[PDB]
């Protein structure tokens, strides 16, 4: 019921950098006004 699609491009992917993106919370602990 699903189709097959092939690309028509002729180049690999590019590359960027994550400057300071991607910081999450490593634990569920509530911390306030601290440096961990």
């Amino acid at each position: 019921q699903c189709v097959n699609l092939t690309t028509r491009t002729q180049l690999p992917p590019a590359y960027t950098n994550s400057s300071t993106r991607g910081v999450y919370y490593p634990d569920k602990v509530f911390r306030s006004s601290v440096l961990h």
């Binding site: 699903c2 189709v3 097959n4 699609l5």
Partner: protein, 49 residues
């Protein structure tokens, strides 16, 4: 709004369980079933006036 969600798994066949996320419009659906995915999966309708 072309990005709808992701697929997560190992073999992406019926012989292994997988995870699926589809935000469609109202509500998001997250299922862990045994999906037999297509080689090129995408969501269905866009609109019809």
């Amino acid at each position: 709004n072309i990005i709808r969600g992701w697929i997560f798994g190992t073999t992406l066949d019926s012989k292994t369980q997988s995870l699926l996320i589809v935000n469609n419009a109202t509500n998001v659906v997250i299922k862990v079933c045994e999906f037999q995915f297509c080689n090129d999966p995408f969501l269905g309708v866009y609109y019809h006036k």
